[PDB]
Design a protein around this ligand. Structure first.
Ligand SMILES: OC[C@H]1O[C@@H](O)[C@H](O)[C@@H](O)[C@@H]1O
Ligand SMILES: *[C@@H]1O[C@H](CO)[C@@H](O)[C@H](O)[C@H]1O
Lengths: 504, 504
């Protein structure tokens, strides 16, 4: 994967509404800023039950968005990352509709998982209660197979039916996706929900030995087609570190809430500890298309004795600080549970979670860019977007608070803001200075400060992070200082917004 | 049960927001119209997960609404009906919080149902799929019993934890509810969701022989304390007919959609057929605090070969007519379109469901009042209320479209309307004429007309229903004509709105 900043975006929410328009925005307004792009599911349909993650036909681009020719065109200037939705598909797909109609007489019957598929002799309460969950309740819903009520395995929405990734039909489907991506000049594959892809009776059904076999087989299939594999693992931090050694890339989901903690309290110790133990073959982010992960730094969902990166009270305080910073907006978008420790994610834009503080935001992006891994910036974050309450009230989908539809006019309005110009300049700096392709090192005191250093062939760069220098939502004091050496000599930036870093 | 019209209301949604104010509205605005009152759950709290149906303390009135002394005061002028939420309680209850803390060491552990208490040797897919559900998804959710993750049985919201009605602690709780109602001068008890009250492995866990035993045992305890029992059962019509012989009262849940069908199509045969086979020990309604039930007249959900009162095509047409009559308002609140506990109940006010037709609405109430049983008028219906789209968009709770907050000023404004004055007078007629305490008989003229007759000691009354003479939402032609005899002789009302009936 090229060590350049990438953009994560929906083809329709950035520009006029198509892949062609999204491509135009990328080329005309973000040249040198975003050299690669992760286009969120643009298959048929992109507006179903889970904003593209419930495809009827994964191999067919939604005609309202464009064609595979548009993807092939974009590849000429940008490396493309696309999702391979390996765990499930829409109930409205031809394959599942065939099973609803014919039941056991359908050639697609072994393609889908039911309670009986995994538990043929039945299940105890322990068997079902032990299944790791990304959504509330049990992972089952009612569907009629040729008139007979069956409990189909659904990890996410009831509309997303889980496939048997080890069945002949299920595997054939996965390979059709891979073939289509390789044929359309895609460079990187994001294996969506792969952690749930293998069901093993008596286990958590998440990142188990059977899942490791699936991931290894999918990785092998990717390399023979010239595709690189990225896996997302929203879990207890140790499971993320464990699988990292077995794959090309993993997302760093621990960094986003640790920086929210650091900027809110002043403590850099958790960030220092994470820097030491974290997998370095990473894809770094602050925001994604989903909510801000809290289970990613907290204690394990199944076993409460295995503690997180920060104590349980600090995770509880992190969630309460986001709610306060957003003035209750994040509370209206996040579903209430038994405790803040039972929360999977907190729905809010990263900018709003920081109380719209420009200095804290540019600092968080700087630390993101300075830690080993290929950085990705989500489109709402690229334009330093605020919580979209208008869309949330319209759709009633919590994650829509962080999924605003940006017209070309609105993108241009936002590109005038000093924080957005600072981010574009910071991304350019990250893409141009050869220091990032060199050796990484870090120095720390106790708490207070942490300095990240990269030394390359013809350059060097050091970023100092001091959150104690400016606490509070209405702060104007810079918490990130930058020093670098290039062709023109030694340079400095004590304010990433007022004095953006430019490579000579 | 006194053969007088009763009002179904929330203590807070009729008046200033208290039991004292609700009592004042009943006495000063509805004197002689409503002689009884079903006060919807006013326990601690009334504004939780399911508008009072998730009590933390069922024996304690919510401090914001009033006290038990207020209920005792209301009893001097009105016969009171209160709910006995026998199937579940809030997770925030002192009993459940103790189980979360101590687990198996809690004295309240056998009081709550888990998957293991019903299925100790495990469960098959058929065992779990066979459990009757008003919507897809299994009746289970996760809770930690002293650190151990357990699957607690929840028939409704995940916050409403199902109790074991056969346990010693579960029965002790139910008796404390009955004792509190008896001591606070309540006359009637509505056993909410009693159909789900008994769980047995291998059965539907809904209206099974074990449930009949519970209903019978709860009835025995009611009469011993001077309380009458009304049971709420939303099911295939035959289950309502069967259980009716074992209780004091059942609701007539078939009449509300049969009248919508009769008023839209002009067909009275299904009303005639129902009049012949219906349980007469009924509590009649048009609207309730929930949505309009359609499965109450349709085919059985667990066995489609058992047909309803009207063919399944007519049930689909009934639902589509409501959607058309409400200009899509009900389509925005029903099932999948908003948050609902029942997928098939149509969320709309009865008045809006008829396209706000005054003649059809008054005719529907007239038929309701003329069929055997004690009539109940829901507060929104008492004020001929329209769909509250503003409260619906504010909460996203589907049933809120039929749960408008009426201030004293809005009540008085609605009391000026001819249709509301017509209903007030019709109910006064229903309470004052002794014909209703006498002999019931009916005649029918082949699918076009039906005449309901009551003959008492000093009077007689006949209501002719002929919906074919006035089809369409913009109808002005009366479809219910009344003839009666009293101390002053023979009288007529060929228009219940322009000439409301008044007893001499
Ligand atoms: O496909 C189901 C879920 O999988 C996750 O990996 C994606 O990031 C989510 O956006 C999606 O809702
Ligand atoms: C009885 O059943 C459920 C559960 O308490 C409640 O939501 C309804 O409002 C009531 O009719």
């Amino acid at each position: 994967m090229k060590n350049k900043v990438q953009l994560i975006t929906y083809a329709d929410r950035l520009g006029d509404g198509t892949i062609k328009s999204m491509t135009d925005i990328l080329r005309t307004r973000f040249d040198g800023v975003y050299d690669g792009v992760h286009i969120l599911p643009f298959f048929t349909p992109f507006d179903g039950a889970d904003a593209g993650f419930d495809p009827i036909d994964h191999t067919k681009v939604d005609e309202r968005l464009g064609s595979w020719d548009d993807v092939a065109e974009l590849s000429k200037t940008h490396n493309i990352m696309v999702d391979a939705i390996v765990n499930h598909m829409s109930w409205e797909s031809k394959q599942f509709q065939d099973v609803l109609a014919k039941g056991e007489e359908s050639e697609y019957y072994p393609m889908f998982l039911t309670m009986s598929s995994v538990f043929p002799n039945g299940a105890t309460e322990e068997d079902l209660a032990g299944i790791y969950r990304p959504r509330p309740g049990l992972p089952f819903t009612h569907y009629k197979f040729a008139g007979k009520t069956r409990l189909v395995w659904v990890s996410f929405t009831p509309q997303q039916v889980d496939i048997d990734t080890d069945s002949d039909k299920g595997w054939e489907y996965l390979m059709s996706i891979f073939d289509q991506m390789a044929a359309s000049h895609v460079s990187y594959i994001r294996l969506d929900a792969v952690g749930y892809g293998a069901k093993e009776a008596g286990t958590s059904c998440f990142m188990t030995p059977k899942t490791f076999k699936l991931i290894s087989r999918l990785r092998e299939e990717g390399v023979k087609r010239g595709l690189e594999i990225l896996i997302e693992v929203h879990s207890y931090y140790k499971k993320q570190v464990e699988i990292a050694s077995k794959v090309d890339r993993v997302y760093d989901f621990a960094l986003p809430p640790l920086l929210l903690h650091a900027l809110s309290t002043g403590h850099v110790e958790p960030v220092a500890h994470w820097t030491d133990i974290r997998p370095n073959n990473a894809v770094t982010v602050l925001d994604t298309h989903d909510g801000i992960g809290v289970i990613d730094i907290g204690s394990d969902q199944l076993d409460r004795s295995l503690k997180g990166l920060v104590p349980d009270e600090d995770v509880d305080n992190l969630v309460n600080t986001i709610h306060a910073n957003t003035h209750g907006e994040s509370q209206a978008a996040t579903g209430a549970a038994a405790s803040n420790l039972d929360l999977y994610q907190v729905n809010s834009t990263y900018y709003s979670a920081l109380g719209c503080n420009d200095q804290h935001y540019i600092a968080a992006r700087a630390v993101q860019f300075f830690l080993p891994g290929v950085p990705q910036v989500y489109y709402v974050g690229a334009l330093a977007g605020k919580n979209d309450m208008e869309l949330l009230r319209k759709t009633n989908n919590g994650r829509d608070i962080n999924r605003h539809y940006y017209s070309t006019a609105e993108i241009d309005e936002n590109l005038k803001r000093p924080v957005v110009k600072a981010l574009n300049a910071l991304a350019k700096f990250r893409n141009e200075l050869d220091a990032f392709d060199g050796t990484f090192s870090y120095t720390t005191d106790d708490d207070t400060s942490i300095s990240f250093t990269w030394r390359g062939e013809t350059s060097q760069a050091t970023l100092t992070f001091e959150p104690k220098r400016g606490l509070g939502v209405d702060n104007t004091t810079p918490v990130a200082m930058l020093e670098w050496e290039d062709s023109a000599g030694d340079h400095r930036s004590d304010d990433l917004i007022a004095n953006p870093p430019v490579v000579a």
